[PDB]
Amino acid sequence: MNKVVLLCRPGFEKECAAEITDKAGQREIFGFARVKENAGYVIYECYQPDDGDKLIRELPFSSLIFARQWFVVGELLQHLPPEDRITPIVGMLQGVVEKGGELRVEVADTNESKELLKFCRKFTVPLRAALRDAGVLANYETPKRPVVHVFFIAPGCCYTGYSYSNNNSPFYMGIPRLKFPADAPSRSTLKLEEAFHVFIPADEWDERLANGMWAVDLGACPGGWTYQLVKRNMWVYSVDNGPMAQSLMDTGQVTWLREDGFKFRPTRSNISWMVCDMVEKPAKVAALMAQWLVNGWCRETIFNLKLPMKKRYEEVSHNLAYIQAQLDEHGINAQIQARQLYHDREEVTVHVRRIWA
Structure with missing residues (x-):
């Protein structure tokens, strides 16, 4: 079978098509992806008769940013x-x-x-x-x-x-089907919850999203992402010149630091997690994320990058490559994965985990 279907956000078919063509090509699995604008899926058709199975075996699904899901298929049943x-x-x-x-x-x-x-x-x-x-x-x-x-x-x-x-x-x-909790201070909370589901295997949550961990939420106001960290029983520094929802403060788990997220530097606690969902240019955010990783200020991070209007797959690939270049220059080994989540619009969410053994 030579066709692989990829589900994507309607309107992002060109990004999904360029990306699968690029990453399959890199593994010498050659083919073509026609685009039907706004269809919400792309078909990558391999030139070789059985390369469809090969592709969904050998290319890691986690490395695809613009695909929500994929599967190999046979011929279209039309009537x-x-x-x-x-x-x-x-x-x-x-x-x-x-x-x-x-x-x-x-x-x-x-x-x-x-x-x-x-x-x-x-x-x-x-x-x-x-x-x-x-x-x-x-x-x-x-x-x-x-x-x-x-x-x-x-x-x-x-x-x-x-x-x-x-x-x-x-x-x-x-x-992933999630319900908005009425007590969270922002619907942005669903993005980070979705991220935890998409990026961290369910059977590893208790170890990696662990009770008692310290986390920092940069640009936190009013607290959508902090809410998810608090729900995991973390101790959280919510960093923002803007005030945090009183409901979060009342938990006894949150310290509000009235500082700029770009300027904040951690001293004092052993920070396991940093998260950042900011309205800023993605090269600027990516630079700050790389600094946190190469300075050892966190073990894992999840953050959002805004997409530009054009060349969206390229831009986000370049941001990720910047972060990887920073890692390599400092000899830090980490796994990077990224996905346009369901609750994302013109942005992508990224997860980086330092490999420390």
């Missing part, structure tokens, strides 16, 4: 007989994957597909039963086996395929 949409799907998947561990019947995240999304929910159980009967799905679900995807691009038109659960998004449509 699904309304009297039996199931048989052709089963037919297309039979002999392609067996004993899959989970089924996800998905759509692109656009306005036009909302009715189609409800169809997919209705279709899921009947399709699951048929795929289990055919041996395409295992009789018992399991996270270790491949995830089977059936992707409807319009009524009666879908692709079918799979992704590997150790190299994909674990979320339906690549969208």
Whole structure:
């Protein structure tokens, strides 16, 4: 199979297409990605017949910024007989994957597909039963086996395929479903919560987002991101000339430092986490993040970079390369990952973890 579908934010198809072409090419997995503006997905079509499976095995999904999710697919099923949409799907998947561990019947995240999304929910159980009967799905679900995807691009038109659960998004449509807590002081809180879900494996939260850790939130006012750190029972320095929500102060976990986030330097505590969601130019933010890493002021950081109006994949790649150049110059080893989260708009969220053994 030679096609790989990538789900993206509608309007970001050129970024997602350039990026997958670039990073697959770098691994000598050559192909082309046509763009349908505002479709909310891109198809990367490999020149070689079975390179689609190779690509979703060998390229780490975590290294893709503009893809919410991906999966390899066969040919487009275009005329699904309304009297039996199931048989052709089963037919297309039979002999392609067996004993899959989970089924996800998905759509692109656009306005036009909302009715189609409800169809997919209705279709899921009947399709699951048929795929289990055919041996395409295992009789018992399991996270270790491949995830089977059936992707409807319009009524009666879908692709079918799979992704590997150790190299994909674990979320339906690549969208973690979060509820805004009425007591948080800003909806920006959902970005950082989504970041924790997307970047830190759930079974590592208690160790890496740990009770008792010290964290610094730069440009914190009024406290959306601080709220998430407090929820993890961290002790937090919220740094801003603006005041923090009284509800956060009342927790007894937060010290408000009335300073500029760019000027603040930590002295005193062992800071594990720093986070930064600021309305500033991304080269400027990236420079401050690199300084925090190379000065050893944090072990991990999550921060947002604003995208410019044009050359958005390039700009954000250059910001990341700057941070990597700083790391390399100082001999610091770290893992960097970045993603246009669901709750991001014209920005990307980045996670950097120093490797200290």
